[PDB]
Amino acid sequence: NREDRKAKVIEVLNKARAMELHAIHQYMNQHYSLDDMDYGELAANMKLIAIDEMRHAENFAERIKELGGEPTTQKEGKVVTGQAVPVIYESDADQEDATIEAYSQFLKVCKEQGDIVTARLFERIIEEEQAHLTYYENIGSHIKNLGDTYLAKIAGTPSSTGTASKGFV
């Protein structure tokens, strides 16, 4: 059953990939809103987390290619726009939490299909999702508990995420 094992892993890898593509767009939308509001540090860290999901999306596609499949290019679920700051961190924490639940199941399938390399990929990525979760939880906890005295400190901070995107041009 070589082919069935391959096919079954590719299916969860494409499920996870589509979840990554949704998070990229969702986090970046919130990044545009945070920058607009001039809350630099929140905006910078939101983009940096979106870049992590980009890297997750890339790794899932590379493994899908190694297994003979085709990486999906459609995002899972819909992006929510116009979210308020308190809503941003509460939904993002919920979404990371849900992501770690789904990936843990995906991990299950990989082990069931005797795929150690893909299982380890999900294991590695779950640890990074956990860092995202803690991040969004903490911010959400400060927002709830301290409100505007917390935000006054973020106002006007730098939004820079480092040297610009090394690209082609």
Next chain:
Amino acid sequence: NREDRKAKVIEVLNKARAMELHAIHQYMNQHYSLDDMDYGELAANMKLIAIDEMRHAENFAERIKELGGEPTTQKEGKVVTGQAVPVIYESDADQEDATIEAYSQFLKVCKEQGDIVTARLFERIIEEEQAHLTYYENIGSHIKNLGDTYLAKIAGTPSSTGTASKGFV
């Protein structure tokens, strides 16, 4: 699983093909010996059957390609040389019989893999193997019952299998 289905059919097609490649060499070895003994009619029909086996190998190969596989180039088992005339026909009948039994199982697998085209290819080739089996049993029977009287009639007969092989030069 589409790919799994194909993989299992390709497996039995390469098993059958390896069996054909064995038969080509076994039968041609006997053709060379019958030609050497100057039993022309026997040598001629041995080669014509070897050529039927070449066409079977070719048809298995082409179906293997349509399925995206690679046709094997190794024969199954070893060629037996130095067989006496009665042994040639006794063993060729046993091999043809063994082949029909195997192909009949291979045909079953194709149906299990929902592969109608490959199953029909097996059914067609099995009927030809039945023609071969019947031929070898008939000759074996004349040799057993008629001895050197039958051979005396075959000595000095034409060995020609027709016009030369349309080839490149």
